[PDB]
């Protein structure tokens, strides 16, 4: 159960805590020898969060016995709120059920917080082909979602062979975001067949609020298949989100 891990930087992980806190409210990061992971769903049934952080992201990584602890998103979010990326993030847990967050930067800040007993049911995710996998940047997703969410609440995703488009309609205000490979915002296209689906942009707003500007974002979804969006962290970590499609109009 006692373990210690030292990760360099505080702001890069604070973006993950920010995205998670804005997409989930109660989660318990499970700690394995391969790294820190978390497979949970928002308690309002809006998104599905799957955090995969290997030990390669962490500078120091010391485990005695793998176990699972619960971390509040709010409190831990407020800790790394003003935490500078030039600090040294230190996670330490000993015999007692306390969490020690030592910062070795301009001022050593050894922290301590209790760890509640979360009863999170470890649920997995099945595998099936989506036939629509796109590789796009993050900033294009930012400006593409924040502008269309004001004119409508649902956005339609359509991907064809070497063609990508995201059109959303409404009462008297239409919009579309069409990108191809020869553009400057779409990296890669792995679309094999015609794909079209509808989703809620209101989930996509807070879902993309924590994304970066140069982070490669990969989306996987289908026609009647759910929405999947995963992106890497420091080229090794992977964060995957899956939300159910909209069965309404």
């Amino acid at each position: 159960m006692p373990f210690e891990v030292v990760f360099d930087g505080a702001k890069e992980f604070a973006d993950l805590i920010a995205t998670a806190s804005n997409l989930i409210d109660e989660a318990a990061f499970k700690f394995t020898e391969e790294g820190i992971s978390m497979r949970a769903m928002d308690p309002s049934r809006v998104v599905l969060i799957d955090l995969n952080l290997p030990e390669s992201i962490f500078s120091k990584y010391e485990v005695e016995e793998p176990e699972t602890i619960g971390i509040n998103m709010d409190q831990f979010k407020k800790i790394l709120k003003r935490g500078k990326a030039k600090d040294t993030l230190i996670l330490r847990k000993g015999d007692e059920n306390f969490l020690e967050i030592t910062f070795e930067g301009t001022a050593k800040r050894t922290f301590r917080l209790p760890l509640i007993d979360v009863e999170e049911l470890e649920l997995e995710l099945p595998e099936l082909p989506f036939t629509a996998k796109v590789v796009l940047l993050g900033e294009v997703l930012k400006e593409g979602i924040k502008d269309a969410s004001l004119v409508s609440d649902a956005i339609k995703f359509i991907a064809k062979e070497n063609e990508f488009t995201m059109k959303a309609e409404g009462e008297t205000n239409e919009v579309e975001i069409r990108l191809t490979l020869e553009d400057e915002g779409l990296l890669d296209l792995e679309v094999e067949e015609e794909t079209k689906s509808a989703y809620g942009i209101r989930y996509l707003s807070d879902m993309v609020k924590g994304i970066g500007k140069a982070d490669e974002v990969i989306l996987r979804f289908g026609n009647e298949m759910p929405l999947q969006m995963e992106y890497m962290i420091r080229d090794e970590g992977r964060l995957t989100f899956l939300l159910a499609p909209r069965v309404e109009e």
């Binding site: 015999d95 007692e96 649920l123 809620g200 069965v247």
Partner: protein, 1118 residues
Amino acid sequence: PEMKAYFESLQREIDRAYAIARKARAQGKDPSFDVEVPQATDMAGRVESLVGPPGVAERIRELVKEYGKEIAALKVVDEIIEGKFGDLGSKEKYAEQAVRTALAILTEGIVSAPLEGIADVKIKRNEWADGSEYLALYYAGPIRSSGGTAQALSVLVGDYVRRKLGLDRFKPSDEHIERMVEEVDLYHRAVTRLQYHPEADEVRLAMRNIPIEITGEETDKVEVSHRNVPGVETNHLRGGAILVLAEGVLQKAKKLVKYIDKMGIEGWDWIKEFVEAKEKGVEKGFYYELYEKFRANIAPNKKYTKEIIGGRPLFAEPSTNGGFRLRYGRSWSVNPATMLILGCIVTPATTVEGPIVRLKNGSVVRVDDYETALKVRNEVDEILYVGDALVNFGDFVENNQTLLPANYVEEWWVQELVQAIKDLYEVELQPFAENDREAVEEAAEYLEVDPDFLWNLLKDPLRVKPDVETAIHLSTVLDIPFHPYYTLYWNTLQPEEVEELQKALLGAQIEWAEFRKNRFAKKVVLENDKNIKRYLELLGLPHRLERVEKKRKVIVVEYPWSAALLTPLGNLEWEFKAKPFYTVIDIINENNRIKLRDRGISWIGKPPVQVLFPIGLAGGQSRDIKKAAEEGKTARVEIAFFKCPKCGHVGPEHLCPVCGTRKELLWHCPKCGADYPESDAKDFNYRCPKCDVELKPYAEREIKPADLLRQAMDNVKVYGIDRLKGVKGMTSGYKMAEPLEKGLLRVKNDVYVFKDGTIRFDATDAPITHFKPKEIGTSVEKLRELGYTHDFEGKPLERDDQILELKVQDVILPYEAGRYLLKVARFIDDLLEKFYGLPRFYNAEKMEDLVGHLVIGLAPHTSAGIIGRIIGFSDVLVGYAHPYYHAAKRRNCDGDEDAVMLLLDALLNFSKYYLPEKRGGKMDAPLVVTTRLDPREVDSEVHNMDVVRYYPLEFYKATYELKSPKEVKVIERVEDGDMEEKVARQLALAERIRAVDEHHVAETIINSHLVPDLRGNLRSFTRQEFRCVKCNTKYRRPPLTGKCPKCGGKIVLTVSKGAIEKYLPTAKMLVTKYRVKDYTRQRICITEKDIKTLFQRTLMGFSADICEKMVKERTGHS
């Protein structure tokens, strides 16, 4: 003479307060000339407080003391009926004064039934049945706060009344009985859920057996089917008839036979048969037999049923008896270390020990004081041991209550010690006190112990307790059982876990030590992988967990817990075996050198009023008087005015603002339109010569506060006022106005007032026995200045940490009453300095300066208030009382909270003219004060001295025969929340979830709150109340109208869709956090109903959705 001299000092202080009350009252600024409230010497003065008669106090003192109140009451009834107090009139008056007076004598003036309970007493005739006369009792509104016993006893009095007058028994007809049964059912189904629901046969027969009839006016606006019933005046629901009928007699049937059998009245065999109808219910260890007797008892199973229906159903462990540890005391005490962590009154105390607590890291440590709980409170997982509690022997529990066996305490063990050395080494040692140096010296010589340790042991056995080696050394010689402190609860689980446990201990690393031939282990090193340590956790054994040695769980039991652990096993010499009808301790004591005793075999457990000024709706929305006087709003209400004969001023003021002469009352004739001063009204005997009607003091007219409020600010010369509000209507009989200057000082003194004109602060107290100055924080010099001279040991009061007894007129109020009543004292001082012109009497500037003054305590449905004296302050919001200050008779009427007021405040602000005429709360008015409470200086003053931890052996040895708490002979043989409570439910419920081992069973605790949400959402759902913006009290019809025809505002509807959506995730997250059946339909039906009403296909059921997961189970199984 000490308590007598203190009573003399109290009498001098009351004489001074009466002198100031007369010098200030003589001014005429109050509706009284002299002091209206008298003092009572004893119960005789308190009986006359209700109805009198004025002069029966001598007969009470001469007959109650001699013959007893049962016979003296009948003697007084005989004196009233025979006409010894004066000619009253018809038989209804003599019968009324006899019932009210006799009721005041039997109840000792504790209840207010002759005042607010019984409306009238009328003799009627049974013309519809035979034509004979009978007695009819008319009850008023407030009847529930009077207790069910006395309500029955009154009827018995009627049985005597008709016996002395010559009336006849009442004959209920069929329509009367069926109507009363209908009133019980309707009153029981909707108004108030009673405890015992009566049956038609016993109401019919029992009602037929009742001699006189009882009824009342309309109490609850509940229409009945049986209308226009002969002999019944109203066609509504009478709450008094049901509470006196059902809850009065049927509830107290097991005591009413004792009253009837005690007085000597014949004709009550039906209640006796009713009591009799309630009686239709080699290889064997001794401890096992005692448990069989404990299970065979009906009292713990029935009370366990009442607590299991009156709370959480099927959540507590059936094996471990939850509740406090049964600690008897002499006629509650709870460690406050567990109050804030997690029925009866929870009395706080810091003298007893605390329970043990399991930490979060795996260790288990005990919490004896409140400081440890503040330290380990952040790692508490569950609360195995609740705590301790003192249960008085004279605990009034009727309906065949048995006395459960007493726990094996450390005091009876001291008694076992002094009798062991007394029977073996003939050493005379008196326990529960300090002995001479000779007896303790030789006892220390034979027992090889420390005399000082024996002094502190005999001094305080709970504080000072021996270690394990002295206990083993003293058990194998005196043939005495082991020490109770180091005695585990071995009778808590099957012996298989013990049989496997000793085998798990055979392989453990156990080291032994030898001290005075005592072979006792020092530590045990054992792993949890071989056997679970759940039984060890149930034993309450402090241990430590360690997993840093690459091992799973290596727990170690160190000294002195190791020796105390291997002591019952006989140091692993004899092998324990699971035997039928033999418990663990029985088999241990079967073959062992040290005996054992089962310790735990028992477990138990607004209104914002500032002035009596009727403003009505003229104050706007908050009835602000300042806004009405400022704007100019008039109040067309019923009020009275006064008249000044000399000057000519007319106003609600008592004293003439212009002149210096006192004005009198004004009487307006209701029929005519003339006003008659008080002087002219009393001349015509308050009768108008023209109209033959009664001159009413008040009348409906207009009120202009702009010209009234201004005439009062210049009197006391005040200008800083914030906001003042009055009442909607005067509930008193005369409806007399209150001087506004009092409110002008209340708005600046930050105090509030009630309808009775007294500033009564509601508080909660508790009876105590003894305490120390350290717990209250009082110096020795202060206690010496209070009047304390010596303790119960006769030693002078010099030691600070010394047990001191409490006197009669002593109260310890919290900080809230100190600052508030301090502000009230400043209101009286400010009231005396400018409004009365008299010097200040309190002269209190700080909270501690209030010590020494006198207070008055008034209880609900009481006409007398016991004068007290503040002696200290407590941090807890509740106060402390004394059994003499707060008697045991007044506690049985379900009265816990009391109203606290000041002496001079009531002496200068209370007026009898403010009595209500039809309505009334739990208490009416402080009509009589009581100060003389001499506690039998010749008789009981000595009995009170020896009460400090008087635990005899006859109780502990005689308790194994399943006695009753009512059998006082065993003692006489030796005597001769939505914020705190909601979180408390969220934590205790989780503790119950941890207690049931993830095995949840359907229950109704939160569902008790979910049903009103279901019927409220479905009920208000089809209502759709339309309320426009401008008009609020103008509701629109449920059909749609488009817009409000009266006002040009949109109509707002209340379908209850957005207000209830806040309480749903509260329990929805808890219900969603577990898969249980029979409740999923209620949880998902309402939210799916909201979905269907308002109108995201979820990929899968990961939010704990039992819908897809469950149906998938059934479908895949088919």
